[PDB]
Amino acid sequence: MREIVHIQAGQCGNQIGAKFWEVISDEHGIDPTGSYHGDSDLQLERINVYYNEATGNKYVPRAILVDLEPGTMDSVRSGPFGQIFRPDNFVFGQSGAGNNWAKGHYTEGAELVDSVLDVVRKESESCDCLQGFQLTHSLGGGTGSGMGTLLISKIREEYPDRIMNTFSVMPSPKVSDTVVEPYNATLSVHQLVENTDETYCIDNEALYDICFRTLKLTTPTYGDLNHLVSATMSGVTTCLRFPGQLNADLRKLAVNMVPFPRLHFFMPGFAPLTSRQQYRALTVPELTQQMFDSKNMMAACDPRHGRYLTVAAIFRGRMSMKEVDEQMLNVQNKNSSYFVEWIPNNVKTAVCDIPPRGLKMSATFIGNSTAIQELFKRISEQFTAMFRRKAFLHWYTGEGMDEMEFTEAESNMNDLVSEYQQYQD
Amino acid sequence: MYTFVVRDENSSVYAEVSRLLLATGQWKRLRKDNPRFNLMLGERNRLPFGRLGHEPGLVQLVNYYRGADKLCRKASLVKLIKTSPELSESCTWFPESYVIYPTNLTDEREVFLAAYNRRREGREGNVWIAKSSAGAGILISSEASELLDFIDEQGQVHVIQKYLEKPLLLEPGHRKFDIRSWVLVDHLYNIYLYREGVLRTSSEPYNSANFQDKTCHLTNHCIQKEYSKNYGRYEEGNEMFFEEFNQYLMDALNTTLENSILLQIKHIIRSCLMCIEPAISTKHLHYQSFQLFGFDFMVDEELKVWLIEVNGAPACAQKLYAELCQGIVDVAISSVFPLAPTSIFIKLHHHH
Amino acid sequence: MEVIELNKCTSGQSFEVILKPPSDPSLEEIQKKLEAAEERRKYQEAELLKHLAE
Amino acid sequence: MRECISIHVGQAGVQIGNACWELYCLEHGIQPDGQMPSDKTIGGGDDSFNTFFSETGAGKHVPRAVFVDLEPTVIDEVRTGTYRQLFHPEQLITGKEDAANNYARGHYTIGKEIIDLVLDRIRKLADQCTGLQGFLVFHSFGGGTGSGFTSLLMERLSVDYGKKSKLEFSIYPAPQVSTAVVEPYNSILTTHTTLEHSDCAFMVDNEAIYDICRRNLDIERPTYTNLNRLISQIVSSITASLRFDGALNVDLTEFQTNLVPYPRIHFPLATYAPVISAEKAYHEQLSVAEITNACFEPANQMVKCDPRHGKYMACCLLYRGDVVPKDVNAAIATIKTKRSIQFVDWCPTGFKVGINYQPPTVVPGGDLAKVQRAVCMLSNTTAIAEAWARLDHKFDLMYAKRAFVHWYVGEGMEEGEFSEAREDMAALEKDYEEVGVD
């Protein structure tokens, strides 16, 4: 009974989190009303990891929906599986965060955070043995970025020895809402460096390019981007939601994926990514070739620019586990220049029998690559292009922040970039 | 795409093999410390065999046989011949040898003097030679007192063996020489003898009444090119190849290189390698081995071939690098990692 | 090739063949190690809370 | 009669323990409910099988075993499995969250909180013994519990049972059946702190068992069940002398006397043959010479290494089935004249032979085929130091960059313990080289 407490904050956080529960609820045979209707016992073996069991054989997601404005969560509550969430687990304000990290972290967010922790404490107290927490949010806004990292800081204080995990959507000028997104992302990244054990970096530009070039979607929407995130979040959590010879809880994964405490930012990947030739059976080689292809990765970082510290691949569906090892052992032994040679056997593979809905087989990719420094370099450059002229700073100094804190976020980010660089040589 | 590493930069042979492997476009070289390799061109000394064959899904191959030093060490070879029943102590193609440890350190000092006094008393030629593996340090003399005293002044194991006082001398010149045969043993323990040998000849007239000047007694390519005043006179680089040497044997001795010398050479190579096959074979091992050997022979005026030593990390004759190295890639490397004639070797069949 | 100490019973037998002749920390100290590591954990955690309190 | 207590620590220890006791019961005619019709002494007796089984008044034969794991999912299989009736609840100890493959977490953080409870349960089994021989401890090198908690348990067993022998069955880490990257750290840390507390240790390299299952049993992708039933045959061959009438290795002490002349060098190599696939149409039955000759093939060694380039210190041949001393010595003569067997000069060149007439028992529905005779050779070769070399090298690659070290320091371990442990292994490798190489 290794329970995980899920939290979703802000617009992006709640929209991506909603689809995630939609996807995995379908995989575990849970309908929108919480009743189970699957045909395999595997669907329930680990159901208590993400769902609570209520009266009448009802399964309620262990999820807490947080936002500083009602709009997004009114959509969830009216969405497909909106009725499945515990009503008490909706915590929201009315002021909004105005895409302002200071408002989410120091002013508006502070006024609401204590009541969020009351719900978190409630869900934790009922866990037999709490694995840890997982947060979904963006870094470019105000609530998910500012209040999200405030929540993490206050969760780590009250649960210092529990694992803190996040899915963090990184901003990109190509898929942008406001110009202050580099400010909010740089301020959040430092909080994550300090207070998260694992962070899956999701770059909206990578999601966009995939919908545009690979999926051949003429006009991508946030909905399209969120379909990729749902599928990827379901893939990375397969290790936790189903049985297998691997076991693996959050702390065991972190112990094998994070060789240094600050370098815990992962690049996820998924395969297949097909356009509507969609019924063609996909062979193991094609799953492996795409899963490692950069065009299938969602951090917008060319892995061939850095080195993999650790790599975890999860294959789903009825396939040849002997042929899986062969293709995996082929990619490594064919590109051993992009794997650090001072972590023996840093490429692990796991197979799951239940495939995602609508696919005979799939593969999810989890890489701890020093190439991620390119993502942080982009954010840093955009931050400094505005901060050197103090552009838009008044939105933040008006909330009580000082220029020094920005200077410190800049140095903290450039240090992180320097730390990745030394392990790339 | 096959992968290989290089852990001996001083190997002229495998510098060419590596240069050929890359030229095929199907072999990729990795850093010398990358464990994910198919082929290791390993170091000469302290090669870590225990770390081979433990990478999942990687068939790993190395260019050295673990345990073959027993054959490529001066003292080791002597002990192997005297202690192995397949070769016996009465082995007829190996000069009478004795292992002699310096007194500042089993040892065969008393056994040597016994056979020495027997020769001295019987009027027989009693000229011996002392040498070791730590030499470039050789001494030739007919007095047992000088041979033993020379070894005590050193600090490593030495070997004293009978000096062939009746060597076969080429004409014109009246000059000594030795024969180098290259032998390749693949993972299946086939014994392939390279069809091309080299006679490393002395450019000085052999003088039996003066073992002090060792230029006419030692046929090493380095000694002749440094202390000899007739280097390159009769043949380029004091190297005569089998085509010429065979033509000479026909003109002078009315015999052929095959009949008079090569039969004994092929026999000696087989006996030496078959003897240690159960000790070094990799037939049922978790990794695979091959290795290039350099056998050095002596020929006396009776056309009898004697084994001098076996080199485990031999070099090749400049003219024969291209042909031999390519041959190593064909029968030793591509036989295990095939790519996408008239073999240059001579297979010496045997019972495994 | 000699056989020595041949012992036979209803369920088997055993013997010996020679081919050739020849030629702690106290309970107290363990508690200190355990408690010393527990103390270093408490220290590191206090420094975490001190950092968070700032 | 003297009793042996088996301790199973961590997933690998518990699942291997489950396979052994399954086999022990089939070998001794014990049913899943603990009944043993052939035992004419009800609720008592000092027979050889009583070294491993106690008896209740109701005639239940109960393993003298304790299962310990910091997480309950593996031991829950025992609580509800086929042989659930054998054990009682006091014997199965489970925590709520494991060591996360972190030696420091199993030794210090979590170990400190459960060590006294485990000693209490073992003390309960000890109080049932009239003359306890010692302990057989099963664990993995890589697991956080198997590595970290085992070393702690061994330290306390030496304190509470000073004069008792301790043998290990340790699983050497193999990347083919492992998803953990830090197992070299755990293996070296647990070997360092356990070395002076274990009298004799049988290492099983998962890589060796894995290839045997693919090569001999034609299993393209073996599972832990496949790996464990094969391992429990080797374990049974090694413990049979303690559980059956005999004169060789009749008590745990004899294992050290026959296999370990030097204390630190206490890791005998195990070689087993024949392993024949059950799915075969029908195999030709191998002779005493052929299976004895097979004991010197690297393909059926529990740890892949080349004994031709080591030196033997001791050699036990344990036969099961149709074997007479006449045929053993005949095959040994042939092997000496063909094999490369070099003993150290300060040890006799000989073999101790034990024969048990009962052939190997095979679990119904298992992978192994019923054979008429099988053998397990226990040889102490310096060649097994190749296993340490491989492991120490991987340790060096990661430790040179302090990779993953923060996870251990975070649980209260000092960084100096890494190097203190590595230097002990460097000394252990030097001991093997001084004994084996000239």
Ligand SMILES: Nc1nc2c(ncn2[C@@H]2O[C@H](COP(=O)(O)OP(=O)(O)OP(=O)(O)O)[C@@H](O)[C@H]2O)c(=O)[nH]1
């Ligand atoms: N042969 C065999 N090896 C196993 C088995 N179970 C785990 N292993 C090996 O043991 C190592 C992992 O250690 P575990 O025993 O699973 O971990 P643990 O002792 O339970 O400690 P934790 O970290 O708390 O889980 C890996 O190298 C596995 O290959 C098993 O049943 N049989």
Ligand SMILES: Nc1ncnc2c1ncn2[C@@H]1O[C@H](COP(=O)(O)OP(=O)(O)CP(=O)(O)O)[C@@H](O)[C@H]1O
């Ligand atoms: N017993 C013997 N009788 C006659 N000549 C001998 C001899 N032992 C050595 N030599 C001479 O010494 C020369 C080489 O000696 P040796 O081979 O022992 O040194 P070395 O090993 O450094 C050269 P390489 O290893 O390349 O063959 C040969 O040319 C040979 O003529």
Ligand SMILES: Nc1nc2c(ncn2[C@@H]2O[C@H](COP(=O)(O)OP(=O)(O)O)[C@@H](O)[C@H]2O)c(=O)[nH]1
């Ligand atoms: N992938 C994805 N990104 C989003 C979505 N909504 C907003 N974003 C991104 O998140 C950032 C805006 O943060 P937002 O969540 O709207 O702010 P918040 O509500 O204050 O937490 C911008 O970089 C957007 O591109 C979404 O539904 N999907």
Ligand SMILES: CS(=O)(=O)NCCc1ccc(F)cc1
């Ligand atoms: C202020 S804006 O530049 O018009 N906003 C565009 C957001 C977006 C862009 C591409 C998407 F696939 C989804 C969303």
Ligand SMILES: [Ca+2]
């Ligand atoms: Ca207010």
Ligand SMILES: [Ca+2]
């Ligand atoms: Ca009884």
Ligand SMILES: [Ca+2]
């Ligand atoms: Ca002791």
Ligand SMILES: [Mg+2]
């Ligand atoms: Mg918004």
Ligand SMILES: [Mg+2]
């Ligand atoms: Mg030489």
Ligand SMILES: [Mg+2]
């Ligand atoms: Mg475990």
